[PDB]
Amino acid sequence: IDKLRLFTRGGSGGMGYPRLGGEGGKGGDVWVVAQNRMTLKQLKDRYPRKRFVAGVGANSKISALKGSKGKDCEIPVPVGISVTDENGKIIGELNKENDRILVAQGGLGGKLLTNFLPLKGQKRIIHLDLKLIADVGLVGFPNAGKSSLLSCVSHAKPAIELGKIMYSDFKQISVADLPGLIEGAHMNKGMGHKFLKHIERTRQLLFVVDISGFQLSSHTQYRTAFETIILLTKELELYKEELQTKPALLAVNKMDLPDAQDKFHELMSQLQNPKDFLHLFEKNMIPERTVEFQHIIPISAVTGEGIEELKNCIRKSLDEQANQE
Amino acid sequence: MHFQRQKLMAVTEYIPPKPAIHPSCLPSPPSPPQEEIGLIRLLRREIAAVFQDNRMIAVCQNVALSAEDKLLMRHQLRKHKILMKVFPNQVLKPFLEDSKYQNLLPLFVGHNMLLVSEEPKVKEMVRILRTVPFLPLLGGCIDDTILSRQGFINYSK
Amino acid sequence: FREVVETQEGKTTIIEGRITATPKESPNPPNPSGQCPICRWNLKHKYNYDDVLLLSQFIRPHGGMLPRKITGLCQEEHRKIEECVKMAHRAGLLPNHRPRLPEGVVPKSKPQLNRYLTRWAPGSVKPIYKKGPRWNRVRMPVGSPLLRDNVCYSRTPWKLYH
Amino acid sequence: AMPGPPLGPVLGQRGVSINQFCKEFNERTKDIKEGIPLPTKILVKPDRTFEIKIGQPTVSYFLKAAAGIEKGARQTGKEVAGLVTLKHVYEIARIKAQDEAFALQDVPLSSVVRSIIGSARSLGIRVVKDLSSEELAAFQKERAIFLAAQKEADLAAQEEAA
Amino acid sequence: AAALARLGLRPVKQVRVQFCPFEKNVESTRTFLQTVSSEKVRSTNLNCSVIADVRHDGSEPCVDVLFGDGHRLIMRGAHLTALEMLTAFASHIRARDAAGS
Amino acid sequence: ATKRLFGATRTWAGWGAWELLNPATSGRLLARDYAKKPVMKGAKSGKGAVTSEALKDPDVCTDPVQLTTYAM
Amino acid sequence: ALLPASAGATEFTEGNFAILALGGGYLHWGHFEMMRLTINRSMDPKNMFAIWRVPAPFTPVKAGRLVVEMGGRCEFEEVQGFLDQVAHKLPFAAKAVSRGTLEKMRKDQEERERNNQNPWTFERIATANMLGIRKVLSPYDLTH
Amino acid sequence: RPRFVSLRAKQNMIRRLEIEAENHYWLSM
Ligand SMILES: Nc1nc2c(ncn2[C@@H]2O[C@H](COP(=O)(O)OP(=O)(O)NP(=O)(O)O)[C@@H](O)[C@H]2O)c(=O)[nH]1
Ligand SMILES: [Mg+2]
Ligand SMILES: [Mg+2]
């Protein structure tokens, strides 16, 4: 939640010298550099104006000619930055410190072709995305116990985010519990789609589905757990087809319910034969393809049931992916 | 500037005329008041009309009661057709000083309210006001006669 | 004045407010036509900082100043009296109007420096390290410009800067 | 305490948005919903009704129901499903003074109007101003001949909006 | 009003206020009665009671306060200001709360 | 159109009840058709000896105070 | 309402209610006139508000001279927000001025200059050549 | 170095002006 935007303008060139024929210095260029220890919010509250202008090329003197280029401006940003344009096209990616990208060029100097005038520079507007998502991304409906699952899986974490799963080998698996996955995603692509843009940069997806189904209101449709999974798959297909290529695991929560066993059995039957029930949904709700789950585990966030096995399965799946790649 | 020119400019400096007696400290001559006011005249007219029309008036202290409870009590009084009106004391004093009800001026102190009625439903008003025992019946007038809370109770009985 | 007295008998406390001697303006002022008390009693330009008898009639028991709306004074004379009260307090001419000290607070041993006609508060003045040249010499304020119009019986006017 | 909530008649929900509000006060959401449904069974479903809940120290609640919304009255009288996107730049609905009087004759029995004991003229003025907010225009005389064209234009505008 | 509501009503049981409306020395008593009857202070403890009685016997304006501690406080408003009476009442209430707790 | 002109569905809020048919203008009271169906009367049109004039002056003063405090 | 186009004393209100007052001398040109007229037309409404010029067409302007005057049915705050910007854009020190203060200031200055009680005046000394002071005095300063 | 006038300088100037004004009067008959 830190999407940024700046206005950049390269300085104009240098005024040439007509009688002799001297060129003026080229205008300063606009560059963005990757540095650590600072964040996008840090940049914003350092420079509230959000505008960067480089130097201006020196005019053509008579002691010297072909003037020196103006002092370029360097814009510091953190690592893992995606720089795009106002149209959203990705200008570049800065993944390591000292990565430098030119965004706006300075104006040319005062050549005779331009009547020795210092041609103006470039005006551009750039966007910043400080989002390099973790390896595991949690996807779940509201109240589907994503925060509770994160709190249970972490030694100590606030369940209202990013957390780490610790192993005996002192290995940490970086997980991201993303709230508001369904903030009218089918209707508000303005806010519930930044969630999908953040989650798209994750290697593994963990869907968390409540066993007791879900319902927004008494006047809203009661969708079962299988219906919730189908809705998740349809939303993923609508958002980005390439996201489904990543490995996905399923976790049916709230096993402490009295009917949880029968509900999970029914859900497993539906998973085994989904084609027999896909007609019940409209053609809009029918996904282009069905997501295959490497593992589906029943878990309970209250009784701390199956969490160790889920962590072991996640580690094994990550190891298998690494070995394959 | 030459020194002689500076001396001349210093000597030809404005000196204010000083009156013998300060205007602020001398007695202020009597001056006409405001010609008219949009709100004070309307308040006076409303007070006169209410006093002439309504025959029973009860002047009491308006405590800082909750608005919901105040509206409930106002509705209870309206069920017996009693109107609750509050006017500024700084404007009520000028009318009360020179009027038939001159002796009631001392009653209007602080936040005051008047329960008025053309029909002297004194018993009903007393029984409604008895719900809140902290509300004091400061004074009243019935048929252009000054009366206290004891007199109002006697009239009700 | 007015006093409040409390008496506790049989676990019952009763507090009563009584009047001993209510102050009031003396009858028949010399010039009743005046608007201010000063202009009624012909005291314009005829009081200074050390006139404790006059100054104490407008001060609260703890040294505070009574409001202009209560005293009926004019703006100019009220400011003059305020400045005179400040100067008298700083000179220590009002020993019985000390500020109220919270319990458990004992002032330390502080330097005892006699002073009078002190315009500013003693805690907000910078020592004059650089006097400057003769024509642009920095002067030390004494008194107050609000009393510049007071009656002077000598040829030389009051010097407000030493 | 007293809590006012606009709830659909016969459509009380144990879920949001009154669920957490009642739960914090410890009031029984299920009992409140059952009582509201029983009391609004006569009232048409989906009609927005004002519900006033009084809270006792022992988690005792006594519901009270007020008259339906005057905005709903204007919309249902002038036959527009939804109000205009803007105000005073376009006219969504179209009601008559007779319709305003008929609506006021029922709205005047509500808690606020009973407390105020106000003549129907002030209520009619308030309803007219509320209709002006709603973009509903009131005409002294009206007939179906022009009302049909107005309804057709409003339907066309709504179809364009959709 | 606000200060007395912040101090609430912890050890207070009953308050009675008497004054003469026909007199010209009951403005302070009326202000004290209004402050005591303010809904903010009363809502702190509905158990505590407040009553105002009006008489035409030309008696002095006085307020009696009976606390749950059986203590009794009498305040005469004839020559006592509203602020002074409120300060005295608040100090007495604080002392009674400290004694009870 | 015809239904809206002939009967009002809003007045009846009971399912069992029926929409109240419209009554002629003659039957209705005269004071009903003596209200400002146009925009509100201005201060100049409002007489100085009227409570509505002072209410509108107070509303304008509050609006001006709010506008001034907006930039604060 | 809108000011008439301009091609390439006067210190008192005559018709308007507010004005733009200049605190110092300056010169105005066609560019300044056209820019000011364009700004006024852009920031004004012809239905209610009227603006009038006071300086001659192309221009030397002295201190305290009102150049642009504004009238209609409006308050001082309604016009100050734009008249201050116009004054700042003016090539000399200028300010949005209101008659209720300008006339009071002028009357007070006139009263002070009439009630001056100095027996010796600069004009008197210069004209009578007292002290031989015209030995150190400008020839134009006798009237200046 | 700035220069400023004093009270007795003012008095001297004023008395000289008075003398010259009296001369003006006596040179008029
Ligand atoms: N009985 C039971 N309750 C559970 C279980 N998991 C979670 N809960 C309860 O359900 C609620 C979950 O809320 P929350 O932590 O916000 O989950 P969430 O999915 O992150 N909600 P959101 O997506 O809106 O942020 C909590 O009240 C929690 O105690 C479970 O396995 N069993
Ligand atoms: Mg959560
Ligand atoms: Mg205001």
Q: Is the Cα torsion angle G132, G137, G142, H4 positive or negative in sign?
A: negative
Q: What is the DSSP letter of A259?
A: T
Is the CB of E54 inside 8 Å of chain C's CB atoms? Answer: no
SS3 content of chain G, % helix, strand, coil (to 5): 45, 15, 40
Q: What are phi and psi of B128, to 5 degrees?
A: -70, -40
Checking phi first, is residue A213 left (phi over 0); if not, alpha (psi -120 to 50) or beta? left
Pocket test for ligand 1, best of A148, A214, A252, A257 (most atoms within 8 A of CB): A148
Q: In angstroms, how far is CA D49 from the centroid of its own chain?
A: 7
For residue F59, report the distance from its CA to the centre of ligand 3, in Å.
Answer: 9
Specify the length of chain D in residues.
Answer: 162
Q: How far apart are CA C157 and CA C147, in angstroms?
A: 11
Nearest to F13 by CA among D74, D79, D68, D99: D68
The reply to whether residue B16 touches residue G121, judged by beta carbons under 8 angstroms, is no
Q: How far apart are CA E26 and CA B69, in angstroms?
A: 26
Query: Where do the DSSP E strands lie in E4-101?
Result: 12-19, 49-54, 62-67, 72-76
Residue of chain B with shortest Cα separation from D113: B75
Nearest to A86 by CA among A130, A122, A125: A125
Who contacts G23 (Cβ-Cβ below 8 Å, separation ≥6)?
G63, G64, G92, G93, G94, G95
Quick one: which H or E segment has residue A120? none
DSSP A197-230: HHHTT-SEEEEEEETT-B-S-TTS--B-HHHHHH
Q: How far apart are CA A82 and CA A91, in angstroms?
A: 8
- Between the CA of residue C86 and those of A14, C111, C125, what are the distances in Å? 66, 20, 16
Q: Which domains does chain D have, with CATH numbers?
A: 1-55 (3.30.1550.10), 56-129 (1.10.10.250)
Q: What is the identity of the amino acid at D129?
A: K
Question: Is position G108 within any domain?
Answer: yes
With tokens 């409906």, the residue in question is A141
- Asked if residues D26 and D67 have their Cβ atoms less than 8 Å apart, the reply is no
Question: Is position G76 within any domain?
Answer: yes
- Between the CA of residue A292 and those of A131, A288, E91, what are the distances in Å? 27, 13, 75
- Write out the residue range of the structural domain in which residue B43 sits: 1-157
Nearest to D123 by CA among A266, A287, F31: F31
For residue C71, report the distance from its CA to the centre of ligand 1, in Å.
Answer: 69
For residue D13, report the distance from its CA to the centre of ligand 1, in Å.
Answer: 21
DSSP D81-146: SS--SSSSSS---EEEHHHHHHHHHHGGGSHHHHHHT--HHHHHHHHHHHHHHTT-EEESS--HHH
The reply to whether residue G120 touches residue H14, judged by beta carbons under 8 angstroms, is yes
Give D83→chain A minimum CA distance, Å: 22
Q: In angstroms, how far is CA A293 from the centroid of its own chain?
A: 23
- Asked if residues C58 and C81 have their Cβ atoms less than 8 Å apart, the reply is yes
Side-chain half-sphere of A49: how many Cα atoms within 13 Å? 4
The reply to whether residue G131 touches residue H17, judged by beta carbons under 8 angstroms, is yes
Q: How far apart are CA B133 and CA B65, in angstroms?
A: 13
With tokens 């879900």, the residue in question is A214
Angle, alpha carbons F33-F37-F38 (nearest 5°): 145
Q: What are phi and psi of G48, to 5 degrees?
A: -115, -40
The reply to whether residue B25 touches residue C33, judged by beta carbons under 8 angstroms, is no
Who contacts E40 (Cβ-Cβ below 8 Å, separation ≥6)?
B64, E1, E2, E4, E5
Q: Is the Cα torsion angle C86, C92, C98, C101 positive or negative in sign?
A: positive
**Structure token digits, residue F24:** 């002629």
Q: How far apart are CA A161 and CA C91, in angstroms?
A: 66
DSSP A34-76: E-SS--HHHHHHH-TT-EEE---PPP--SSS-SPPPPPPEEEE
Strands A51-53 and A4-9: parallel
The reply to whether residue F51 touches residue B42, judged by beta carbons under 8 angstroms, is yes
Q: How far apart are CA A70 and CA A13, in angstroms?
A: 8
Nearest to A301 by CA among A173, A170, A231, A212: A212
- Give resolution in angstroms: 3.0
- Asked if residues A226 and A160 have their Cβ atoms less than 8 Å apart, the reply is no
**Structure token digits, residue A134:** 């973790």
Q: How far apart are CA F28 and CA D97, in angstroms?
A: 9
Q: How far apart are CA D153 and CA D142, in angstroms?
A: 16
Q: How far apart are CA A13 and CA D102, in angstroms?
A: 77
How many structural domains compose chain C? 1
Backbone gaps in chain B, preceding residues (C–N over 2.5 A) = none
Interface of E with B (CB under 8 A): 1, 17, 19, 21-24, 26-27, 30-31, 33-35, 37-40, 50-56
Q: Where are the alpha helices (DSSP H) in chain B?
A: 3-11, 38-53, 67-79, 89-97, 122-129, 149-156
Q: Which domains does chain E have, with CATH numbers?
A: 12-95 (3.40.30.10)
- Asked if residues D14 and D33 have their Cβ atoms less than 8 Å apart, the reply is yes
Specify the length of chain C in residues.
Answer: 162
* Contacts B–H by Cβ distance under 8 A: 14
Q: In angstroms, how far is CA B80 from the centroid of its own chain?
A: 26
| Touch between A and E (at least 3 CB pairs under 8 Å) | no
With tokens 């005047």, the residue in question is D108
Strands A123-130 and A136-140: unpaired
Q: What are phi and psi of G75, to 5 degrees?
A: -90, 175
CATH number at residue B86: 3.30.70.1730
Q: How far apart are CA C105 and CA F57, in angstroms?
A: 54
**Structure token digits, residue A49:** 């104006």
For residue F40, report the distance from its CA to the centre of ligand 3, in Å.
Answer: 21
Q: Where are the alpha helices (DSSP H) in B66-142?
A: 67-79, 89-97, 122-129
The reply to whether residue A217 touches residue D16, judged by beta carbons under 8 angstroms, is yes
- Write out the residue range of the structural domain in which residue G69 sits: 9-144
- Between the CA of residue B140 and those of A126, B81, B84, what are the distances in Å? 78, 17, 13
For residue E36, report the distance from its CA to the centre of ligand 3, in Å.
Answer: 30
Question: Is position G50 within any domain?
Answer: yes
- Asked if residues F53 and F46 have their Cβ atoms less than 8 Å apart, the reply is yes
**Which residues of A does the annotation place in the binding site for GTP?**
140-147, 177-181, 253-256
Q: How far apart are CA G48 and CA D82, in angstroms?
A: 37
Cβ count within 10 A of residue A226: 20
Nearest CA to ligand 1 atom 21: A143
How many structural domains compose chain B? 1
- Asked if residues G66 and G17 have their Cβ atoms less than 8 Å apart, the reply is no
Q: In angstroms, how far is CA A88 from the centroid of its own chain?
A: 13
Q: Please tell me which chains touch F, using 3 or more CB pairs under 8 Å as the contact test.
A: B, D
Q: Please tell me which chains touch H, using 3 or more CB pairs under 8 Å as the contact test.
A: B, G
Cβ count within 10 A of residue A16: 26
Q: How far apart are CA E48 and CA E97, in angstroms?
A: 14
Interface of F with D (CB under 8 A): 1-6, 8-11, 13-15, 20, 22-23, 25, 28-29, 31-33, 35-37
Experimental determination approach used: cryo-EM
Nearest to E53 by CA among E41, E40, E62: E62
Q: Which of B7, B8, B9, B13 to mutate to test the interface with H (most CBs of H within 10 A)?
A: B7
How many structural domains compose chain G? 1
Q: How far apart are CA E37 and CA E45, in angstroms?
A: 12
Q: How far apart are CA A291 and CA D136, in angstroms?
A: 52
- Asked if residues G95 and G84 have their Cβ atoms less than 8 Å apart, the reply is yes
- Write out the residue range of the structural domain in which residue C51 sits: 1-162
